Amino acid sequence: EYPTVSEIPVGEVRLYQIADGVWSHIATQSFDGAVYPSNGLIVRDGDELLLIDTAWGAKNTAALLAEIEKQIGLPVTRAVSTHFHDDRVGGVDVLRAAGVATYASPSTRRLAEVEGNEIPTHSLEGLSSSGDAVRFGPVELFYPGAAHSTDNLVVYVPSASVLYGGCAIYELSRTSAGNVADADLAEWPTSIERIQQHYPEAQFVIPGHGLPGGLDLLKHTTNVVKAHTNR
């Protein structure tokens, strides 16, 4: 069973092995009154680990980098932030202090700075226009276009057919739409289509938040997006 938010004390962080050499990480943070869980990804790269998105904040991220050492016992070497919000770049400072080389599209770095969020050090070139793609070690890095944010990226592990959608995909539990404060509601369904086309073989689908599912997580999200459009 996958961790639910009611069993993760704040500042704590669990793992969950999807596949041989592919894990998710699961944290919590509280935001004006409530509790929300956040997913990242950990991909084995030979004898190194590649981390996808922070555990949402310095403290959580410090913790996540301790659990990896105890449980998997390999070094996290490179890190990618799938978008500029604090559940993704939150902890970039910590990671870099810890020997991790940190990455993000130039598009994401620019919005993070404007927002004031922490800014990954390196710049990922070649995903400025949809539906762009570049390879980064054990994964491919995909720009489907504007959706939950204008810069959002998505990740695929071919080795294990795991696709990580980030906050541009919701879990089925999520029926109403979230902070679409930075969203491009206009293009969000279009941009999901690009995803569906680029990875039809994907067996596990992991959203930014909550319970994994299959590729039917995409149609779920498109439905909730359009509902909100006409609100």
- Point out the residues that are catalytic: 83, 85, 87, 148, 179
Q: Are strands 122-123 and 34-45 parallel, antiparallel or unpaired?
A: unpaired
CA distance 87 to 40: 9
CA distance 102 to 89: 9
User: Are residues 196 and 170 in contact, defined by beta-carbon separation less than 8 angstroms?
Assistant: no
Binding flag, residue 2, ligand FZX (CB under 6 A)? no
Residue 207 marked ligand-binding: no
Largest CA distance in the chain: 49
Q: Residue 127 or 138: which CB sits closer to Zn ion?
A: 127
**Residue closest to 44 by CA, chosen among 26, 61, 19:** 19
Q: x/- site string to ligand FZX, residues 14 to 53, per CB under 6 A?
A: ----------------------x-----------------
The residue within the footprint of ligand FZX, chosen from 178, 187, 189, 224 (CB under 6 A), is: 178
Q: x/- site string to Zn ion, residues 143 to 172, per CB under 5 A?
A: ------------------------x-----
* Three-state DSSP class for residue 110: helix
From the CB of residue 129, how many other CB atoms can be counted at a distance below 10 Å?
8
Binding flag, residue 71, ligand FZX (CB under 6 A)? no
Q: 203 to 222, contacts with ligand FZX by CB under 6 A? A: 208-209
The residue within the footprint of Zn ion, chosen from 85, 109, 174, 194 (CB under 5 A), is: 85
Q: How many residues make up the chain in this entry?
A: 231
Structure tokens at 30: 């509280």
Q: Residue 88 or 194: which CB sits closer to ligand FZX?
A: 88
Residue 87 marked ligand-binding: yes
Residues that bind ligand FZX (CB under 6 A): 36, 87, 167, 174, 178-179, 208-209
